[PDB]
Amino acid sequence: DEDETTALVCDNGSGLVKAGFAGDDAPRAVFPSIVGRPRHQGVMVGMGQKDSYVGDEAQSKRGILTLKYPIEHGIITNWDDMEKIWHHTFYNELRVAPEEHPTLLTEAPLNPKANREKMTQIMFETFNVPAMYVAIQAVLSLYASGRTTGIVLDSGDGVTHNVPIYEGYALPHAIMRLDLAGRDLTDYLMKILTERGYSFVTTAEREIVRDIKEKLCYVALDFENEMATAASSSSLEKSYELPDGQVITIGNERFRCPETLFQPSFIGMESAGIHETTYNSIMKCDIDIRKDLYANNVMSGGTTMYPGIADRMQKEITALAPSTMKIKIIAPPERKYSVWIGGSILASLSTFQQMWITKQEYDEAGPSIVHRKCF
Template structure:
């Protein structure tokens, strides 16, 4: 085992759609892969190919045609501990190629993660992976720190696999939703093609901006809930009057669904300001 000064803590951010892992002090994660575990749909379908009981991350995604894929994390909360343990094992031994018993571990959790889940995370780290020390931090707080702030409000919105890919390639937030809707009705200028994993090609039109708009207008899909701008405002109004000004000036968007074009690009500030205020 190396000297204490040479031992870097491991950081593992377990998101609903993606796992980000690396070493404390690095500028970026060493490993980023889907938070999925796949198992063969039929026994013996991969004879002669070294079939395994389970596949994790990119390998599971590449074999999706013959696997049943599952997400062990739902809305930021671990729902399948056996699969979650497989993801952690893959993270430590295959992605980072380290012995977890030689490194302190920092894990992340959702703000409303039940205490029992935190205890289970701790149990697995100590009893299964023999970590010498571990800490569980709230993802939103870490997002705030990563943006160089210690005071602020974080809007965290997660993602999933195929929808994530479509969203990153095609989706955008409309500067003027009603005007964009009229444009989509009168012409095909907003239409784009997307090839699904099975080879089927679909055409996506107004959905490119209608889907992100649901974040601001949940009523578009029949949900009686406030939009993210109202949720952010309501959250700030529940805080002490003294810190509201700081919160308004430090709103951080976090999570895969907040990276739609038009939120953080050159048009982003005006769009977010228009939607929120």
């Protein structure tokens, strides 16, 4: 722990938890949001026999544990799970006590207000954090980009959000949430791999196939033409070496998996591709600034490490929108940490401690005070 009473910066992103100290450039403890629990009961002795398993421990013990998600698309299952994982993060991973450091947290866009009131109340009772602040990840990604104008595409693991912000101002009237995310990607890839001869249901293979998505997946420039040329495609077809050692070969599926988000009709969504969701979002607001939105679009999330989103994005928007002004996307490398960086940025300036949510305000007005203290 630093000698100074600097604040805690924790991004509880929908899919990854990244925690550390204020003034740091990158979060120190970063782990996926999976939680493992003993698949069977206790009869043995001498070691183990522990209920909750979180972090890399559960990653190593994936096979023996039922792998469960305490949060999915924002919905909260069991607050005890968050209690334990935050205990682990603060003491076993961050080696910090929350008594002496206020916490800045980031929440998924348009999270329930009742969810905020319950989570804040359990937090304040269970923990002894001196002060509090929670913010939407959209403005955090904006801060990471450091440009007040643009539309943020936050692609988490449970929801994809499109949020327009012009000159550092939120536009909730033109903000939308789409239920397509990593979960859907894994599902669709699971069914295609089932049609390829490999049919698995458990979560270990879920992580294997999301790793495959991280490594080999394409974003098709032209879809049906690329499957037409991918009929044989000995060179274009790509293989992976699974940890057991078998060589699993995939061809068109590499660019047929992210295409489900672009073409939702593959597995039955009324909503069109996410580019249509950015398009409608843009026109809902006044006409004039729309061009700037076209030229200032930002994309954020862990998924963004994949190739192909930028070219597809620009080409389709130019197809939909007039091609007079030039559209260009901006995306700094390793932007999944960017939100946490913005949290540090929030703690950088000396005005931030004017609106810390202190203990006594919550003791006076209950959780309801946040309704007036954040917004």
